[PDB]
Amino acid sequence: HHTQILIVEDEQNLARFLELELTHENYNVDTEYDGQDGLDKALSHYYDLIILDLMLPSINGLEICRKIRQQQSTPIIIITAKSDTYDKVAGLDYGADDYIVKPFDIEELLARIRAILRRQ
Amino acid sequence: HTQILIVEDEQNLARFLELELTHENYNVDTEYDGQDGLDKALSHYYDLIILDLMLPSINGLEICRKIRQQQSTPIIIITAKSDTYDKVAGLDYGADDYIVKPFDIEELLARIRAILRRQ
Ligand code: BEF
Ligand code: BEF
Ligand SMILES: [Mg+2]
Numbered sequence: 001h002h003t004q005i006l007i008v009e010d011e012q013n014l015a016r017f018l019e020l021e022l023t024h025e026n027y028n029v030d031t032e033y034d035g036q037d038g039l040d041k042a043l044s045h046y047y048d049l050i051i052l053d054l055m056l057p058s059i060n061g062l063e064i065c066r067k068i069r070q071q072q073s074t075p076i077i078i079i080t081a082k083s084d085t086y087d088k089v090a091g092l093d094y095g096a097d098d099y100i101v102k103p104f105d106i107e108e109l110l111a112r113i114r115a116i117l118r119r120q
Numbered sequence: 121h122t123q124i125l126i127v128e129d130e131q132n133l134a135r136f137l138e139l140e141l142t143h144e145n146y147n148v149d150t151e152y153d154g155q156d157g158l159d160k161a162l163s164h165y166y167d168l169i170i171l172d173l174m175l176p177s178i179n180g181l182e183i184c185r186k187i188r189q190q191q192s193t194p195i196i197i198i199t200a201k202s203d204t205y206d207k208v209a210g211l212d213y214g215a216d217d218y219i220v221k222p223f224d225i226e227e228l229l230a231r232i233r234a235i236l237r238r239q
């Protein structure tokens with residue numbers, strides 16, 4: 001019984017870093033670097049929480065978020081270099097549970113994962 | 121739904137949030153002192169509590185711990201403390217979100233909506 005996380009992120013250094021840091025916290029992690037592959041994975045497997053970058057190949061994160069939310073209430077955290085207030089609001093209103101501006105400290109992401117999953 | 125408590129000692133900010141939130145059809149109570157805020161939270165029902173960290177009498181992290189000891193009530197921390205250690209502590213002590221000042225009201229309102237989806 002492991003908590004399952006999907007990361008959709010096209011910057012492969014950060015993607016691997018997040019995978020390693022989350023695996024160290026005893027999460028099971030799947031990663032996708034392409035937006036369509038990430039959506040397809042999110043819809044075909046059960047995750048406990050999904051981490052979504054916004055600028056991705058094929059389709060971008062807000063479309064992924066919308067299409068996941070047509071099917072699932074699965075927690076979503078958006079991570080992105082997009083830091084304007086409107087981008088944050090739009091992402092939360094499309095159903096993301098949190099929204100973190102890059103670059104961030106891993107310990108903050110881990111704390112926010114814990115806080116969201118506490119209420120599941 | 122509608123009941124919000126704000127514990128914030130910077131009164132210009134508190135009245136702003138109070139008015140903006142009331143404009144959004146929330147019923148807002150506010151307290152400028154940390155002990156009064158904690159007392160209010162434990163004595164009265166709220167749907168969501170907004171906690172500053174740096175307050176007179178008792179600091180917001182301790183308020184958060186004591187509330188979460190007794191209630192499931194959603195908590196958003198708002199604070200000028202931007203350090204990662206403080207974010208991690210606030211979230212681990214029971215806060216559902218943590219916003220660094222300054223922030224735009226539409227962000228707060230969106231995070232309130234998102235947190236109330238979690239119940
Ligand atoms: F490409 Be992600 F929005 F940083
Ligand atoms: F006084 Be609060 F922590 F900004
Ligand atoms: Mg990207």
Ligand SMILES: [Mg+2]
Binds near residue numbers: 128129130172173
């Ligand atoms: Mg203060």
